């Protein structure tokens, strides 16, 4: 019946684990990008009617309420439905999608989809604090590792990486160089000034006056090959390929898009940056969750009626080169049209924001090269994949 | 947007905080109701297209992959995408709703919407633990009260309930009476054997004897207005009518419905219990979050073009006597048709589960009375309500 | 040059782990027995000039200051020196001794020696809270077990028990019956009303009005042999002899003695209950700390000029029957003159108070039987022993 | 009561809170200074009769057997009895004193008195962890501030220092000047190579380079009255003269002296550094705990029948500029003879260690100046002071 477009799209820069976003809570990162994406959209908060955020790890009680706090804190009416959502790595896109969905079904004609994730502030739980340990030592569980660990086989996503690396024969040397690359593309992209407009800086009050964060700090410009073959496989003793060097970072960030029913954009006469074409999810094997994008991507393409190499730009996420290389191959993607600015290996992987962050990236590149069609996807821990495609205006 | 129906809906009995379900995790709760819900629709693990599941507090790492784990452990196919949602109190319908939405948009025909919450096992968090609290006392955060506090004013929901009690003019006695009513209703409803149908029993085999749980132990059989009359109003210092007596409980439960497309359902030789007619969302003032159902509800009829008089059976969650009556006050509603069997005061309120939980109470009951139009709604923390209406077969 | 006597001697009754003393902090148990022992001594706090308490496990910051708080809280002048002291199991006597010592050397003529220990309130430390765990799960250390574990060989005192049980060939059956005995002697002693005057009750404000604790609750009057041979050795897999049944309890308590320079008692004309004869310490093997009493006892006897079987009454502590039996033997003590009311197995082992508690016991028995000479000793974890002897008036 | 002498006294340099000694435990600190102190007296492990050791905060289970572990790990005989003492700030002399007392009373002739404190490694406690905090936020207790809070008024020692500053009329500048004086004195004292003698260096071998620590890193060389002048008074809202600038530090250190009997010492061909002439204790008002040294001191001369004029060299611990001057004000004391080398402001104040620590500074220095009569005293939290005086050879 109906149609949805993206008026604005914006993000914080990405922090390193316990770096420059350390002291900034997901509620705050999120409120900001909400407020900023309105400004660009030239849109009042009064006239928004749904918000969805993706987040995984609760830093604090607000995060239970996170999507209402990001929305309300960033100017949106208290009269607006807001929902936080979790699909692990895919949460940010998924928030985009569930935002999309309500408009599609006429729940409203203005929706915001975003995400926020502050791994530096992930907590430790004390599972025995409520009802006590009578006796014997006890635990303080790292929730962040919690999040990075398959909930059936109690293993790290990096372990699942080895699996897909072996299943598709992606050698260490694919991964190390895919990584060295991601850095190149990012550092270049950064120097090239490519992200300036999509990034919203975070004014942080600090001693000696304020301090402001605008530049994705995970990326490395001295990017050497022998830098990053010096690493040893971190997730397995014998037969290792996956390293710190070739794996996703742990990172802090937010991201939002303002969306609209096409008509309402015309009635506003705002120039969107794209329409939603289609989207498709999937559950792949948990022990190889890293390829979920491939099935999801195949599905999404169908319902668009479009095919591979209709694809001007792809942002599909580098959880690990081991899986990113795999996902490129099985789909026969063209390396330099997939993550041309770099990805989770280079800028970082703020898990629950990532899906929404790269969206803002991808849309913003589309405007640089003025291609028409666009693909974002990522693998989701626990054996899932997500994907959407958009179409330049 | 071609029609969707529930083919089965099944749930646990409701634990009291630290009661029958103390030692039972959400993962295991969710997995049970899935497997059992799926049996009741005669549906295989491998036919299920999608899973959404409403939870709020994370109890352990696995809770982050909550819906996905409910699924697989419950015999569901790997292939299916799974999702966790948070909308606090409303989280449990949204699961039903968001999932509905996947059929409507023909992402699939076979999908499931559940909820799961174990307040028993709510953790405490150590926010200083990662980076350390260098000096000075630190905290351990009751995450379960965290869920139960409004994130803007940092005041308990019960406090908001006082505010609703004032505006809408409810008094200690109307709520106290209502509370008794819910309990009478509940104690009877079980005695009626009304709930045997829906409740999956929960086997947890103790050494030196093994036990089951299949009746909603929060219910105060053998109770009176005097018990209500007796309590001191807890949530505020001055002029307080709200007490633990008339308030919602703290509890543990899960619940799931299988849903289908008018076609796949008819084309499976499957009597449905009902069909999804519409749904309604609403953003309201955090301070009076208790009325969200009324706005969301007015919406809900309108979309379906129906009226208050029209509906046969009604499950609008009672978080509190004050709001729950104030909901009905402002919808003139038929009080004997309202929580025919009682609610969170009586059975209890394990919030992530509840939206899913009332729905089951509703659908099943619709059969008992053989009505046509049926309401499910509930208020939410932070300023929201949610509604959904369905009709028989 | 000088001489020291004991005017009064008093104690709380002993609580079980997490029993009736659960909510009572060592500062409070201690303040009480200080105040009470003055009353019996018919002595002002103004006229005390030194306090020493024995304690091991810090429940809270006060316990760093414990001896000043017990003293000051129980009426003693702020003008009085107060010191907390730790010699593990032997701390309570040791406090007696260090109290003694100052008077002997003319630091003052009125001194109090006591102890307090609340194992129910022992804490957990979070060793990584100050400077953080960057990453990975972490610990909450049980401090009570801390205290029960050799600090070289990181093994439980019960493990050291097996050692002494084997070194001296004390068979399980010695230990089980020594235990069944201790219970008899205690239950009998209790019914016999033997402790009434030495015990100070703890008025505890509670719902339904106050609740008061006066009766040592660890003791068991249904004392059966086959009750307590049903136990399995708790501290070792193969070759076990030591059990829960035949080992010391974990317990809560306090105890104080008022002491005096003889003269000052005469000048007061107070009737002491004994003079200090002599005292002797020792370091024995850590892996068999359980026999420290034997060497210490040998030493103490010398400096008195007295010999074994000058000994009307001995209280020498049952950390474990395995060690108590051993210590009886090597010294050829007469079973029924050693711990005639029972001991740590029966009433409990509030480690840091124990030394001072049994003192109050022993002195009080001396008055029952009117013997003249008296021996208290105990083994100290980590390879130590302590002992003193006193002389009826 | 025949004479006692120090044959050696040795110590560590003083860590800053979280500095050189971060990762060094009290057990290991204490063990070092013992072994080294014993070398300097030419004394074997197996000759030592007794050990007392002053500590306040327990950092790990082993700290409960603190003195015993200092001993054995430091080559001391098992046979020797060992003891831990707590008197907060004074804990470090008491060790010296209580031990002295064992020789005096001829319990032995060869014994040792130390102190050890690592404020770096102070734990945080979870008082609810054992029995659980069923509901509601709980706490994690900064045990190190716990040590630094008065247990009656729950106010910081620095607050008491303000009270002493008022009564005794010290001002921001006198203390600020004093502070500078201590620092000048200290920076010089090290430059003088005065401390090489006493300080045992501390080898902790890092991978990729191994490091030592043998100079008192708290000292602010290169500093000024301007730095003092600059600070905002931290400990109180109104009319405050006390700041981190002029206050004691938070630090890590250990220290031990071997002591003997005039006879065993002469009868071992051993030059002693000094001999114990007397000691003095004092209870005072918690609120002004800073003057305890003056009363304890007036006592101390009297017992020895000496006078203020009489003493050559003086180490009265400076917890604070305000008290430390107020001590001297009321003893008219010779300010250039007072902390000749500085104090807790300069070198620092790791409280359990400090009493032992100043003593060493004192004895050694007495040699440097070749005086006869030497003072060691310090105030204590909760309302006490402690003193001791010695003479050369």
- Is residue D216 within 8 A of residue D186, CB to CB? The reply is yes
Asked if residue B78 lies in contact with residue A283, where contact means CB atoms within 8 angstroms, the answer is yes
Virtual CA dihedral for D173, D175, D177, D180, nearest 10 degrees? Answer: -140
Alpha carbon of D34 to those of D9, D77, D114, D116, D205: distances in Å? Answer: 9, 12, 8, 11, 20
Distance from CA of A202 to the nearest CA of B (A): 21
Q: Is D139 exposed, middle or buried (0-12, 13-18, 19+ CB in 10 A)?
A: middle
How far apart CA C220 and CA C216 sit, in angstroms, is 10
Q: Which of A156, A183, A218, A349 is catalytic?
A: A349
Q: Which residues are CB-neighbours of D380 under 8 A, at least 6 positions away?
A: D87, D88, D89, D90, D289, D292, D386
- The values of phi and psi at residue A118, to 5°, are -125, 80
Chain centre distance of CA B32: 17
CA–CA dist C70, C34 (Å, integer): 7
How many CB pairs (< 8 A) connect A and B? 187
Conformational region of residue C246, where left means phi above 0, alpha means psi within -120 to 50, and beta covers everything else: alpha
Q: How far does the CA of residue D336 sit from the closest CA of chain A (Å)? A: 40
Helix (H) or strand (E) holding A365: helix A351-369
Domain boundaries, chain B: 1-124+194-276, 152-193+277-390
Positions of C marked active-site: 89, 349, 379
Of D18, D140, D145, the CB nearest to B139: D140
CA distance B236 to B197: 40
User: What is the distance between the alpha carbons of residues D273 and D8, in angstroms, rounded to a whole number?
Assistant: 7
Return the closest-CA partner of residue A331 out of A371, A283, A379, A285.
A379
Is A70 strand, coil or helix?
helix
Q: Which of C133, C135, C139 sits opposite A137 (nearest CB)?
A: C139
For residue A84, give the DSSP letter.
E
Contact A99, A50 (CB under 8 A): yes
Q: Under 8 Å CB-to-CB from D85, ≥6 apart: which residues?
A: C83, C84, C85, C86, D52, D53, D54, D55, D67, D91, D94, D95, D98
CA–CA distance, D94 with D102 (Å, rounded to integer): 12
Kindly identify which residue of chain D lies nearest to residue A139, measuring between CA atoms.
D129
User: Do strands B373-380 and B313-316 pair parallel, antiparallel, or not at all (unpaired)?
Assistant: parallel
**In A, which residues are within 8 Å of B80 by CB distance?**
283
Q: How far apart are the first and last CA of chain B?
A: 18
Catalytic hit among D156, D218, D364, D379: D379
- From C161, C174, C194, C94, select the one nearest C319 (Cα to Cα): C161
Residues D248, D320: Cα–Cα separation, whole Å: 6
Cβ distance D132 to A135 less than 8 Å, yes or no, reads: no
* Separation in Å, CA of D151 to nearest CA in chain C: 6
- At the top level of CATH, the class of C1-124+194-276 is alpha beta
- D261 touches D181 (CB < 8 A): no
Task: For residue D310, give Cα distances in angstroms to B9, D301, D313.
Answer: 94, 9, 10
Using beta carbons and an 8 Å cutoff, which residues of C are at the interface with B? 126, 128-135, 138
Name chain A contacts of D135, Cβ cutoff 8 Å: 130
Q: Which residues pair with A10 in a beta bridge?
A: A256
Judge contact between D364 and D9, C-beta under 8 A.
yes
Name the 3-class secondary structure at D17.
coil
Scan for tokens 């059975």, then name that residue.
B347
Return the DSSP state at D183: H
* Nearest residue in C to A148, CA atom: C136
10 Å CB burial of residue A77 (0-12, 13-18, 19+) is middle
User: CA end-to-end span of chain D, whole Å?
Assistant: 18
CB-CB neighbors (< 8 A) of B131 in chain C: 132, 134
Q: How many helices (H) and strands (E) does chain A have?
A: 11, 15
Query: d(Cα A316, Cα A362) in Å, to the nearest integer?
Result: 10
CA A314/CA C34 separation, integer angstroms? 78
Q: What b/e sequence results for B267-276 when a residue is b if at least 16 CB atoms lie within 10 Å of its CB, and e otherwise?
A: ebebebbbbb
Q: What is the dihedral of CA C74, C76, C80, C85, to 10 degrees?
A: -30
Q: Indicate which of B60, B61, B129 best probes the interface with C, i.e. most C CBs within 10 Å of its own CB.
A: B129
Rounded to an integer, what distance in angstroms lies between the CA atom of residue D204 and that of residue D201?
Answer: 10
Give exposure, D176-201, as e/b (b: 16+ Cβ within 10 Å): bbbbbbbbbbbbebbeeebbeebbbe
In a 13 Å sphere around the CA of C152, the CA atoms on its Cβ side amount to 19
CA–centroid distance for D348 within its chain: 9
What is each CA distance from A390 to A43, A51, A304, in whole angstroms? 22, 20, 10
Distance of CA D135 to the CA centre of its chain: 42
Instruction: Tell me if B348 sits within 8 A of B248, measured CB to CB.
Output: yes
SS (H, E, C) chain C: CCCEEEEEEEECCCEECCCCCCCCCHHHHHHHHHHHHHHHHCCCCCCCCCEEEECCCCCCHHHHCHHHHHHHHCCCCCCCCEEEEECHHHHHHHHHHHHHHHHHCCCCCEEEEEEEEEHHHCCEEECCCCCCCCCCCEEEEEHHHHHCECCCCCCEHHHHHHHHHHHCCCCHHHHHHHHHHHHHHHHHHHHCCCCCCCECCEEECCCCCCEEECCCCCCCCCCCCCCCCCCCCCCCCCCCCCCCCCECCCEEEEEEEEEEEHHHHHHHCCCCCEEEEEECCEECCHHHHHHCHHHHHHHHHHHHCCCCCCCCEEEECCCEHHHHHHHHHHCCCCHHHECECECCCCCCCCHHHHHHHHHHHHHHHHHHHCCCEEEEEEEECCCEEEEEEEEEC
Are D294 and D330 in contact by the 8 Å Cβ rule? The answer is yes
User: Cβ(B392)–Cβ(B274) under 8 Å?
Assistant: yes
Cβ–Cβ of A383/B78 closer than 8 Å? yes
Closest residue of chain D to A134, computed from CA coordinates = D130
Q: Between D321-330 and D293-304, two packed helices, what is the crossing angle to 10 degrees?
A: 40
Q: What is the number of other CB atoms lying within 10 angstroms of the CB of residue B39? A: 15
Taking a C-beta distance cutoff of 8 angstroms, is the pair B21, A111 a contact? no
Instruction: Please give the C-alpha separations between residue B165 and each of B240, B247, B319, in angstroms, as whole numbers.
Output: 9, 12, 13
- How many interchain CB pairs under 8 A, A with C? 46
> Distance (Å, rounded) from C-alpha C130 to C-alpha D250?
14
D133 contacts in A (CB within 8 Å)?
129-130
CA torsion through residues D349, D352, D358, D361, sign: negative
3 state SS of B113: strand
The single-letter DSSP state of residue D14 is P
The Cα C204–Cα C190 span in angstroms is 21
Q: CA-to-CA distance for B218 and B252, rounded, in angstroms?
A: 10
Do the beta carbons of residue A264 and residue A188 sit within 8 Å? Answer: no
User: If DSSP codes are grouped into helix, strand and coil, which group holds residue D382?
Assistant: coil
Residue A301, φ and ψ in degrees, nearest 5? -60, -50
- What is the nearest CA distance from A203 to chain C, expressed in angstroms? 26
Rounded distance, CA D292 to CA D380, Å? Answer: 7
Cα gap A325→A318, rounded to integer Å: 9
- DSSP 8-state secondary structure symbol assigned to residue D63: G
Phi, psi of C283 (to 5 degrees): -105, 110
Spatial CB neighbours of D119, under 8 Å, sequence gap ≥ 6: D17, D57, D144, D147, D250, D251, D252, D350, D351
In A, minimum Cα distance to C138 occurs at: A140
Is the alpha carbon torsion for B38, B42, B44, B47 positive or negative? negative
With CA atoms as reference, the chain D residue closest to B135 would be D142
Written as six digits, the tokens of C355 are 């030394």
d(CA C318, CA C86): 19
Choose among D252, D17, D285: nearest CA to D155. Answer: D285
Distances (CA, A) of C113 to B85, C257, D317: 62, 5, 28
The neighbouring-strand residues paired with C275 are C5, C391
CATH number of C152-193+277-390: 3.40.47.10
How far apart are alpha carbons D206 and A114 in whole angstroms? 46
B137 contacts D139? CB cut-off 8 A: yes
Structural contact between residues A381 and A88, judged by C-beta atoms closer than 8 angstroms: yes
Tokens of D214: 């043998």
Tokens standing for C198? 């030495």
> What are C309's strand-pairing partners?
none
Q: Which of A277, A193, A372, A327 is nearest to A3 (CA)?
A: A277
Q: What distance lies between CA A10 and its chain's CA centroid?
A: 12
Alpha helix (H) residue ranges in chain B: 26-40, 66-73, 91-104, 143-147, 157-167, 172-191, 225-230, 262-266, 293-304, 321-330, 351-369
**Cα distance between residue D156 and residue D235, in whole Å:** 7
Chains B, C: CB contacts within 8 A come to 27
Question: C50 vs A59, C274, D296, CA distance in Å?
Answer: 51, 19, 13
- Using a 10 angstrom Cβ sphere, with 0-12 exposed, 13-18 middle and 19 or more buried, the burial of residue C372 is middle
* The one catalytic residue among B50, B89, B156, B183: B89
Tokens of A206: 């600090």
Catalytic residue among A89, A183, A281, A364: A89
Residues of chain A with Cβ-Cβ distance to C138 below 8 Å are 124, 139-140, 142
Residues of A in contact with D134 (CB under 8 A): 130-131
Interface residues of C toward A, Cβ cutoff 8 Å, are 18, 124, 126, 128, 133-142, 144-145
Give the CA distances from residue C311 to residues A93, C323, C335, C341, in Å, rounded to whole numbers and listed in that order.
84, 20, 12, 16
Of C329, C328, C333, C324, which is closest to residue C354 (Cα–Cα)?
A: C324
CA angle C196, C200, C205 (to 5 degrees): 125
> For strand C15-16 and strand C211-213, is the pairing parallel, antiparallel, or unpaired?
unpaired
Residue of A nearest to C128 (CA): A140
CB contact set of A326 (below 8 Å; sequence gap of 6+): A164, A165, A167, A168, A170, A290, A291, A294
Chains in contact with D, counting 3 or more C-beta pairs less than 8 Å apart as contact: A, B, C
Structure tokens at D27: 């057990």
- Residue-by-residue DSSP string for A189-213: HHHTTTTTTTB--EEE--SSS-EEE
Do the beta carbons of residue A322 and residue A239 sit within 8 Å? Answer: no
Q: How many CB atoms lie under 10 A from the CB of residue B159?
A: 18
Q: Which of B121, B133, B142, B144 to mutate to test the interface with D (most CBs of D within 10 A)?
A: B142
- Hey, what are B204's tokens? 């947890």
CA distance D16 to D252: 6
Task: Identify which of D78, D284, D285 has the shortest CB distance to residue C383.
Answer: D78
Q: What's the residue count for chain B?
A: 393
- Decide if A139 and C134 are in contact by the 8 Å CB cutoff: no
- Domain D1-124+194-276 matches domain D152-193+277-390 at the CATH topology level: yes
Contacts of C222 (CB under 8 A, 6+ apart): none
The tokens describing D258, both together, are 């071997």
Which residue, among C183, C172, C170, has the nearest Cα to C234 in the 3D structure?
C172
Question: Most D CBs within 10 Å: which of B135, B136, B139, as the mutation test of the D interface?
Answer: B135
Dmax (CA) of chain D:
67
Q: Which residues of A touch C (CB under 8 A)?
A: 18, 124, 126, 128, 133-142, 144-145
Q: C291: which 2 tokens?
A: 């026999």
Q: How far apart are CA B19 and CA B37, in angstroms?
A: 24
Is the Cβ–Cβ distance between D78 and C383 less than 8 Å? yes
Residue A293's nearest CA partner among A167, A301, A366 is: A301
What's the CA gap between D129 and D365, in Å, rounded?
Answer: 48
3-state secondary structure of D210: coil
Chain D residue whose CA is closest to C125:
D125
* Cβ contact D141–B137 (<8 Å): yes
Helices (H), chain D: 26-40, 66-73, 91-104, 143-147, 157-167, 172-191, 225-230, 262-266, 293-304, 321-330, 351-369
Task: Output the six-digit token pair for A102.
Answer: 């309500």
C281 to chain A, closest Cα gap in Å: 32
**Residues 6 or more apart whose Cβ sits within 8 Å of residue D284:** C78, C79, D291, D292, D295, D383, D384, D385
The reply to whether residue D134 touches residue A130, judged by beta carbons under 8 angstroms, is yes
- Shortest CB distance from C81 goes to which of D64, D126, D282? D282
Run of H or E residues at A111: strand A110-118
Closest C-alpha among A334, A290, A344, A293 to residue A311: A334
Block residue for tokens 């100052």: C102
Closest to A254 (Cα-Cα) out of A70, A97, A44: A70
Buried b (16+ CB within 10 A) or exposed e, B207-222: eeeeeebeebbbbbee
**C contacts of A138 (beta carbons < 8 Å):** 124, 139-140, 142
Nearest by CB to residue D68, choosing from C78, C80, C384, is C384
Which experimental technique did the depositors report for determining this structure?
X-ray
Contact B129 C133 (CB under 8 A): yes
* CA C151 to each of CA B22, C286, D126: distance values in angstroms, whole numbers, following the listed order: 37, 9, 22
Q: Which chain B residues touch D133 with a CB distance below 8 Å?
A: 124, 140, 142
Cα dist from D382 to B83, D244, D287, D325, whole Å: 58, 21, 8, 20
């Amino acid at each position: 019946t109906r149609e949805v477009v993206v008026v604005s799209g914006v993000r914080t820069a990405i922090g390193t684990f316990g770096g420059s976003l350390k002291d900034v809570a997901p509620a705050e990162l999120g409120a900001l990008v909400v407020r900023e994406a309105l400004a660009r959209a030239q849109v009042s908060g009064d006239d928004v009617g749904h918000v969805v955020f993706g987040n995984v790890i609760q830093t604090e009680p607000r995060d239970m309420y996170l999507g209402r706090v990001a929305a309300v804190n960033g100017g949106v009416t208290i009269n607006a439905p807001a929902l936080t959502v979790n699909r692990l790595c895919g949460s940010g896109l998924q928030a985009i999608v569930s935002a999309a969905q309500t408009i599609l079904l006429g729940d409203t004609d203005v929706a915001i989809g975003g995400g926020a994730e502050s791994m530096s502030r992930a907590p430790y739980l004390a599972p025995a604090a409520r009802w006590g340990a009578r006796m014997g030592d006890a635990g303080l569980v790292d929730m962040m590792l919690g999040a990075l660990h398959d909930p059936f086989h109690r293993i790290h996503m990096g372990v699942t990486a080895e699996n897909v690396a072996k299943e598709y024969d992606i050698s260490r040397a694919q991964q190390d160089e895919a990584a060295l690359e991601s850095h190149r593309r990012a550092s270049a992209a950064i120097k090239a000034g490519y992200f300036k407009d999509q990034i919203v800086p975070v004014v942080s009050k600090g001693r000696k006056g304020d301090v402001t964060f605008d530049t994705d700090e995970h990326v490395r410009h001295d990017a050497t090959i022998d830098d990053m073959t010096k690493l040893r496989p971190v997730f397995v003793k014998e037969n290792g390929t996956v390293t710190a060097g070739n794996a996703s970072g742990l990172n802090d960030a937010a991201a939002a898009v303002v969306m609209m029913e096409r008509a309402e954009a015309e009635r506003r006469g705002l120039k969107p940056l794209a329409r939603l074409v289609s989207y498709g999810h999937a559950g792949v094997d948990p022990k190889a969750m890293g390829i979920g994008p491939v099935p999801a991507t195949k599905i999404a393409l169908e319902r668009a009626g479009l095919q591979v190499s209709d694809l001007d730009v792809i942002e599909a996420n580098e959880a690990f080169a081991a899986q990113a290389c795999a996902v490129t191959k099985a789909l026969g993607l063209d390396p330099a049209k997939v993550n041309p600015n770099g990805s989770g290996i280079s800028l970082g992987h703020p898990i629950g924001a990532t899906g929404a962050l790269i969206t803002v990236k991808a849309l913003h590149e589309l405007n640089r090269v003025q291609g028409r069609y666009a693909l974002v996807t990522m693998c989701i821990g626990g054996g899932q994949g997500i994907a959407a495609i958009f179409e330049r205006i």
